[PDB]
Nucleic acid binder design. Sequence first.
DNA 1: GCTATAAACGGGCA
DNA 2: TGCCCCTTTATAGC
Length: 191
Amino acid sequence: NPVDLSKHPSGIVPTLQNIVSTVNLDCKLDLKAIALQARNAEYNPKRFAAVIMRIREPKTTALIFASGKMVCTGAKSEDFSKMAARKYARIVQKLGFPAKFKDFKIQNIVGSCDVKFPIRLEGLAYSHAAFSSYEPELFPGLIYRMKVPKIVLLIFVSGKIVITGAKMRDETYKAFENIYPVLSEFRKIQQ
DNA sequence: GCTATAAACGGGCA
DNA sequence: TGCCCCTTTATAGC
């Protein structure tokens, strides 16, 4: 609630919007059995090899594979992603699979924020051509590939920003603080 | 729906 | 190894 200015000298804190984590349930799973018995689980192996299962709290989607690997998507924080993963693991256990909870790992963190002024994207693409891809007839946002940390930002004329590719939220924050002074150089008036 | 980004998974191609 | 999918999420123009 007090913004730590040593991590956010802009004074702006990106909001986390999506976490991807993995965990190894460490046993073989009968996906047809799981899809039949579990209420909110779909399975079309012709299309995709996973059982797709969804829970309401934390609101998430798991991809559960016959190998015992699981991907958990959609949570708003690292803690919520781990808590959701444990709930999916318990669902599988309650069906009689002896599932464990091995090597849980946060794999991707997506954040977004709003610098609250419009941005002349053409100018940023021009001066940062090596890191920028801006093709407004293909997609209206500028794609910025930051090297340190290795992070991708989507930058929009509105001042909204998407920040993805982090394994640690401090990478999300560092990328935003690296880009904020650059964005400010291309601020334009809002009609 | 399409177009754009990252990551994991199993799985098609080379 | 790479390519192409696969779900999720913010963003936003056709």
